[PDB]
Design a protein around this nucleic acid. Structure first.
Ligand SMILES: CC[C@H]1OC(=O)/C=C/[C@H](C)[C@@H](O[C@@H]2O[C@H](C)C[C@H](N(C)C)[C@H]2O)[C@@H](C)C[C@@H](C)C(=O)/C=C/C=C/[C@@H]1CO[C@@H]1O[C@H](C)[C@@H](O)[C@@H](OC)[C@H]1OC
Ligand SMILES: [Mg+2]
Ligand SMILES: [Mg+2]
Ligand SMILES: [Mg+2]
Ligand SMILES: [Mg+2]
Ligand SMILES: [Mg+2]
Ligand SMILES: [Mg+2]
Ligand SMILES: [Mg+2]
Ligand SMILES: [Mg+2]
Ligand SMILES: [Mg+2]
Ligand SMILES: [Mg+2]
Ligand SMILES: [Mg+2]
Ligand SMILES: [Mg+2]
Ligand SMILES: [Mg+2]
Ligand SMILES: [Mg+2]
Ligand SMILES: [Mg+2]
Ligand SMILES: [Mg+2]
Ligand SMILES: [Mg+2]
Ligand SMILES: [Mg+2]
Ligand SMILES: [Mg+2]
Ligand SMILES: [Mg+2]
Ligand SMILES: [Mg+2]
Ligand SMILES: [Mg+2]
Ligand SMILES: [Mg+2]
Ligand SMILES: [Mg+2]
Ligand SMILES: [Mg+2]
Ligand SMILES: [Mg+2]
Ligand SMILES: [Mg+2]
Ligand SMILES: [Mg+2]
Ligand SMILES: [Mg+2]
Ligand SMILES: [Mg+2]
Ligand SMILES: [Mg+2]
Ligand SMILES: [Mg+2]
Ligand SMILES: [Mg+2]
Ligand SMILES: [Mg+2]
Ligand SMILES: [Mg+2]
Ligand SMILES: [Mg+2]
Ligand SMILES: [Mg+2]
Ligand SMILES: [Mg+2]
Ligand SMILES: [Mg+2]
Ligand SMILES: [Mg+2]
Ligand SMILES: [Mg+2]
Ligand SMILES: [Mg+2]
Ligand SMILES: [Mg+2]
Ligand SMILES: [Mg+2]
Ligand SMILES: [Mg+2]
Ligand SMILES: [Mg+2]
Ligand SMILES: [Mg+2]
Ligand SMILES: [Mg+2]
Ligand SMILES: [Mg+2]
Ligand SMILES: [Mg+2]
Ligand SMILES: [Mg+2]
Ligand SMILES: [Mg+2]
Ligand SMILES: [Mg+2]
Ligand SMILES: [Mg+2]
Ligand SMILES: [Mg+2]
Ligand SMILES: [Mg+2]
Ligand SMILES: [Mg+2]
Ligand SMILES: [Mg+2]
Ligand SMILES: [Mg+2]
Ligand SMILES: [Mg+2]
Ligand SMILES: [Mg+2]
Ligand SMILES: [Mg+2]
Ligand SMILES: [Mg+2]
Ligand SMILES: [Mg+2]
Ligand SMILES: [Mg+2]
Ligand SMILES: [Mg+2]
Ligand SMILES: [Mg+2]
Ligand SMILES: [Mg+2]
Ligand SMILES: [Mg+2]
Ligand SMILES: [Mg+2]
Ligand SMILES: [Mg+2]
Ligand SMILES: [Mg+2]
Ligand SMILES: [Mg+2]
Ligand SMILES: [Mg+2]
Ligand SMILES: [Mg+2]
Ligand SMILES: [Mg+2]
Ligand SMILES: [Mg+2]
Ligand SMILES: [Mg+2]
Ligand SMILES: [Mg+2]
Lengths: 134, 206, 118, 57, 115
RNA sequence: GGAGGUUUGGCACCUCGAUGUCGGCUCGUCGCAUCCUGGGGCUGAAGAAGGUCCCAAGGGUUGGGCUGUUCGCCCAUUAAAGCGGCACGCGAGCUGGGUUCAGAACGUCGUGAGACAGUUCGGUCUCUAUCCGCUACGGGCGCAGGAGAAUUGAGGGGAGUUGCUCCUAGUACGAGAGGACCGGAGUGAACGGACCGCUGGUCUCCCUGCUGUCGUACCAACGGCACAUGCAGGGUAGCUAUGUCCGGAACGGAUAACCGCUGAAAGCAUCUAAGCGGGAAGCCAGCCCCAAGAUGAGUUCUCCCACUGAAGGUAAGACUCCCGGAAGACCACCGGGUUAAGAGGCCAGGCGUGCACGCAUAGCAAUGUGUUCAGCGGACUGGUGCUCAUCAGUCGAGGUCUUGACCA
RNA sequence: GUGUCCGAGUGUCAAUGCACUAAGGCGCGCGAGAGAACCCUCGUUAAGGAACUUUGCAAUCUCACCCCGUAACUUCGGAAGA
RNA sequence: CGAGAGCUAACUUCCGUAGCCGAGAGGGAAACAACCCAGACCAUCAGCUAAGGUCCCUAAAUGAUCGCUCAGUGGUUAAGGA
């Protein structure tokens, strides 16, 4: 569960380290890139939901510097996620990974395992770069 | 229309194919056909049938004679199903087939006298930023002088519980025929072991 | 509330037992679940969780165990029902000495020296 | 704050309020093994028998 | 609500609930009968029956399991060597209540508890 | 030219033996001059996105930074971030930031005491609800006999939102880029009900570990106090969300703007003047819940009958009391009450804890191993007559009359 | 509220502190049930972490002793338990 | 009714004038100090009338005759249109 003010850790090498969320969305991956809408009142990003955020600390030398507005997608809840079989997964630390408005990541490689729900939301590009799913 | 009575037993895990699902086990045991109400002799069409036999020593005489018209053992519960005209006795197998939607009606669990934050999802009010309605309290209750009224219908502390509740489009997961059990997808209301009734969907949506 | 004379317990257990499988007795040492996952489109795939077993919960169909790994730097944990069809097989790797049934302290430790005894 | 009642309450409405304070006479019943009366599911105060003699006195 | 919980506070805290149970145990074991309020007697019966069945094991473990609740040694010997072997034949149900009726001061309905 | 009364006002009518005032918070409900959604007309409407007007109030209308703010600005989203009323709704509901009591300081005015609706720090918001009104829960009585149980629904409520994607179909349209109506399939969001199998919360003495100090003679082993659990570590049943399942709907009817059929008054034309058909998230019905104190008191099935002198023993049948209950403040409801598994206990199983005491051994010892998947035990599932539901008591029908029909 | 004097022990760097307790003294002159809403003093809390709000107000968090290490600035003492 | 002041606003304010109210009961105007009728000495289970009325509430013609409006106009305005 992501909410505004919840800092998350970037899952890529785009060159920010920490991004405080500022909105949950409700759009997926469409054929015109990312979708719009879904209703604008949802209040919890779970794994595989897009979420605007302000970058808080970044790396010196970086595509993304500090303070910039960026749409991340989330790959690592501390909260549990539960499959259609009854598995549960949880990760010690929350983590997200920045993107551009087509769903393509903005870093070279994703860093640490991503949830498999990303595969359910046709986020193919992110999950290609990821050392493990689950 | 078609329906039967039974008792909620408990909840469980289940695997249809590989998808784990929560089912609820009702026991819909055989029901005698006590009284066949027809509009030509009762003004409306219905059937009344029984569940959970009662020891004949515990019956009143009038109820022994009510059942005794029908050749039926005393049963602690009788109920009526509108538009329903079976034959013999209402076994649960014959009434249901696996996967069909069935409304599930039972009596909600009585939680007694409940506040507004619990009963109506009220907001609460700060738990530290000054008050002494720290939680719980409904706040204001009306306008002012014009309508001096507080609206009829107004939501308030009260008996949150014990309501009859219907729950729509539950899915028959499985039918054990010779046990008179019946699995239903997801939850039904009640304390365990309360009466409940299973019926055809009130709205057969496409 | 109807008042049948009924064993609620054996009634449940009779339908909860078709859906109960048993596997290798343990609790708290390290383990490898060889699971299927098929979310890969239509084709099927294996995948391997190996971590400490930190808890045992449930019975019959509802029984489920909790295993904890560190994969690529980040800690991971997971709850498998013993009954789950997407859990093909489970093998131990080594028995652990442990004074206690839960091992939630492993969450706070996350070092090499925060191991399980042999 | 400080609610108070408005108009003094009348004799009649007061009595309708007290309409429920009627006391309920105990269902007394005489001891089979003695003279006197005894409360049901208790020992006879006078004799002390609940079936033999149960209390001392 | 208590839609399944079990017990009673007796208008007191945890340690008080506890000493009261332990000490009325000690008394009705010391003395075979006592008279006390009807509530508190219904309270006492399952406690003290559990305890006599603890003492029905014979063993040093059973006597130490009783010694923890009954810290006057002489009652521990009574319940252990005198009373539990007596109830040897009894499948549970080592106590009864009859109700003596109502007290004057507070208008409580007191009762007797014996074995 | 009108309308509405939400603004700044005017006026001074009730209120100075008191009508608490701005903002927030909490609850809401209403209007419609309609922010979204639905149905339309015209369009400088190809398509798509629009403009603007008409009908439409069922529901819905986001979260943050700035300031006491309302407002406004901005962030980032949205189907949309509607406008007002209800003492600028709501302090016997809450705050107390603003402003408006005493302190003090600054600027400005005054020779001075002092001052400005200029500023700045600070500054007591009163346990007990009679009535009406509102949510719950009983008692009495009524319903032309006395009773157990099932019911019809007069008539009352709740619910009512929508986005996105896909198919149709890259078709109609379009030079092209773009790109549909209608119909069909799916998937979320927020909200609601229920539920506790799952994921977790908590479970104040169910199990364990820890310290100090007392105490059980001492050692061992335990208890007490360290909170009203000493602290920590887990935690079953219950209760619960962030957790699960369900929902909004379709079909129907009459309708608003609108669109038409037949068609005159005027041998044309015209949806109307007689007549008829089509048309909305709205009205009625349809879904779920209440309900015959619907004194208009309803129906059906069954039982006891016709007793003795308004009364009294009584039948059918309730209650009192006892024991309890996923029922509850009390009441009430549900179960059992000896032709009895109602609860307790006891036994077996479940689940929680995690290897008890003691003894053996290892080792200077701290401690380690075995016996020991041990020991212990709240609420869980069943059995079992070991304990309590003993004895009893109390109440409870003889059914008015008139008219009409059917029977000897 | 009320001036002066004496005020033991165990442990804890120390102490008249804190916890348990000797002596001594007392359970505070309505009780008993029950385990609704609400209210007061409290314990734990998923995920998030100040989003709350006039203001982080309140409640956390920090906690004693020992060793190491500590800035801008300075009136050379200090800031410093940084 | 006649003026001023006001916006040819006000249950506004200030004068002239008549009447009512103050000090006034009774019938009408659903209700209503001011409007319309009518100034209560007392008593009656008597009669004619005023204003206002005559379908039922609710006393009294579902009165009569020539029309007018098919809008519930009646039972809330205007410029303007038909
Ligand atoms: C009840 C709590 C206090 O409440 C108060 O202080 C409450 C006072 C109320 C609110 C006041 O009334 C208000 O006055 C406004 C100017 C107008 C307002 N409305 C109506 C427009 C009106 O409500 C006060 C002045 C009214 C009366 C009741 C009064 O003078 C009260 C005096 C005493 C009141 C109370 C006295 O409190 C005192 O405070 C000390 C700190 C206490 O230790 C104790 O002193 C012995 C206590 O008693 C004097
Ligand atoms: Mg910038
Ligand atoms: Mg709150
Ligand atoms: Mg008020
Ligand atoms: Mg009004
Ligand atoms: Mg009124
Ligand atoms: Mg924990
Ligand atoms: Mg007050
Ligand atoms: Mg008390
Ligand atoms: Mg035992
Ligand atoms: Mg007054
Ligand atoms: Mg007043
Ligand atoms: Mg309109
Ligand atoms: Mg539109
Ligand atoms: Mg278009
Ligand atoms: Mg609205
Ligand atoms: Mg409003
Ligand atoms: Mg105003
Ligand atoms: Mg106001
Ligand atoms: Mg203030
Ligand atoms: Mg000067
Ligand atoms: Mg300030
Ligand atoms: Mg108070
Ligand atoms: Mg008080
Ligand atoms: Mg009648
Ligand atoms: Mg109806
Ligand atoms: Mg009514
Ligand atoms: Mg469509
Ligand atoms: Mg709910
Ligand atoms: Mg649990
Ligand atoms: Mg010792
Ligand atoms: Mg010990
Ligand atoms: Mg002590
Ligand atoms: Mg002490
Ligand atoms: Mg604990
Ligand atoms: Mg329709
Ligand atoms: Mg028409
Ligand atoms: Mg039609
Ligand atoms: Mg709809
Ligand atoms: Mg009689
Ligand atoms: Mg009862
Ligand atoms: Mg009974
Ligand atoms: Mg007996
Ligand atoms: Mg039983
Ligand atoms: Mg040992
Ligand atoms: Mg317990
Ligand atoms: Mg049992
Ligand atoms: Mg038997
Ligand atoms: Mg000294
Ligand atoms: Mg000392
Ligand atoms: Mg010392
Ligand atoms: Mg001290
Ligand atoms: Mg003294
Ligand atoms: Mg005392
Ligand atoms: Mg507290
Ligand atoms: Mg928390
Ligand atoms: Mg943090
Ligand atoms: Mg805020
Ligand atoms: Mg602050
Ligand atoms: Mg301040
Ligand atoms: Mg503070
Ligand atoms: Mg320097
Ligand atoms: Mg220095
Ligand atoms: Mg320091
Ligand atoms: Mg003028
Ligand atoms: Mg005037
Ligand atoms: Mg004047
Ligand atoms: Mg005068
Ligand atoms: Mg006069
Ligand atoms: Mg007059
Ligand atoms: Mg009038
Ligand atoms: Mg009149
Ligand atoms: Mg007057
Ligand atoms: Mg007058
Ligand atoms: Mg007037
Ligand atoms: Mg006139
Ligand atoms: Mg006349
Ligand atoms: Mg006349
Ligand atoms: Mg008349
Ligand atoms: Mg005109």
């Amino acid at each position: 569960m992501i909410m505004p003010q919840s800092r998350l850790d970037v899952a890529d090498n785009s060159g920010a380290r920490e991004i405080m969320c500022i909105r949950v969305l409700n759009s997926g991956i469409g054929g015109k890139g990312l979708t719009t809408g879904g209703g604008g009142n949802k209040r919890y990003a779970h794994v595989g939901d897009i979420i605007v955020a302000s970058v808080k600390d970044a790396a010196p030398r970086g595509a993304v510097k500090a303070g910039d507005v960026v749409k991340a997608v989330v790959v690592r809840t501390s909260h549990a996620i539960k499959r259609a079989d009854g598995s549960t997964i949880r990760f010690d630390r929350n983590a997200a990974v920045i993107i551009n408005n087509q769903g393509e990541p903005r870093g070279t490689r994703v860093f640490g395992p991503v949830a498999r729900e990303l595969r359910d939301r046709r986020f193919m590009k992110i999950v290609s770069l990821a050392p493990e799913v689950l | 229309m078609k329906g039967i009575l039974g008792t909620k037993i408990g909840m469980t895990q289940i695997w249809k194919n590989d998808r784990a699902i929560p089912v609820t086990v009702v026991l819909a045991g055989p029901c005698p056909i006590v009284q066949r109400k027809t509009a030509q002799t009762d003004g409306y069409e219905a059937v009344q049938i029984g569940y959970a036999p009662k020891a004949e020593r515990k019956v009143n005489k009038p109820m022994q004679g009510h059942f005794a018209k029908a050749g039926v053992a005393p049963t602690r519960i009788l109920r009526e199903f509108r538009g329903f005209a079976p034959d013999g006795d209402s076994v649960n197998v014959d009434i249901f087939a696996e996967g069909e939607k069935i409304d599930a009606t039972g009596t909600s669990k009585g939680k007694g006298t409940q506040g507004v934050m619990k009963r109506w999802n009220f907001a609460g009010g700060p738990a530290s930023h000054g008050s002494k309605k720290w939680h719980r309290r409904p706040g204001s209750i009306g306008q002012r002088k014009t309508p001096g009224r507080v609206y009829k219908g107004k939501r308030m502390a009260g008996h949150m519980g014990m309501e009859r509740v219907t729950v729509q489009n539950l899915e028959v997961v499985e039918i054990r025929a010779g046990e008179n059990l019946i699995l239903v997808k997801g939850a039904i209301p009640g304390a365990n072991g309360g009466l409940v009734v299973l019926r055809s969907a009130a709205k057969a949506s496409a | 509330q109807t008042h049948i004379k009924i064993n609620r317990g054996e009634l449940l257990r009779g339908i909860e037992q078709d859906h109960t499988r048993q596997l290798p007795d343990f609790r708290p040492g390290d383990t490898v679940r060889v699971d299927t996952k098929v979310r890969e489109g239509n084709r099927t795939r294996s995948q391997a969780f190996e971590g400490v077993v930190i808890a045992i919960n449930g019975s019959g169909s509802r029984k489920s165990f909790t295993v904890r790994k560190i994969s690529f730097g980040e800690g991971v944990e997971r709850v498998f029902p013993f009954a789950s069809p997407l859990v093909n097989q489970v093998t131990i790797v080594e028995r652990g000495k442990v004074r206690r049934a839960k091992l939630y302290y492993l969450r706070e430790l996350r070092g090499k020296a925060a191991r399980i005894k042999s | 704050k400080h609610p108070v009642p408005k108009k003094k309450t009348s004799k009649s409405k007061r009595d309708m309020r007290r309409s429920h304070h009627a006391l309920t006479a105990p269902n007394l019943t005489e001891c089979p093994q003695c003279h006197g009366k005894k409360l049901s599911h208790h020992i006879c105060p006078n004799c002390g028998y609940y079936d033999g003699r149960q209390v001392l006195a | 609500m208590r839609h399944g919980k079990a017990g009673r506070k007796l208008n007191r805290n945890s340690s008080a609930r506890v000493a009261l149970a332990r000490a009325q145990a000690t008394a009705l074991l010391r003395e075979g009968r006592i008279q006390t309020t009807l509530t508190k007697a219904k309270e006492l019966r399952p406690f003290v029956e559990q305890l006599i069945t603890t003492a029905k094991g014979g063993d040093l473990h059973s006597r130490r399991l009783v010694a923890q609740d009954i810290h006057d040694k002489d009652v521990v010997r009574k319940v252990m060597d005198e009373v539990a072997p007596k109830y040897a034949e009894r499948p549970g149900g080592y106590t009864r209540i009859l109700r003596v009726g109502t007290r004057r001061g507070d208008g409580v309905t007191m009762a007797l508890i014996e074995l």
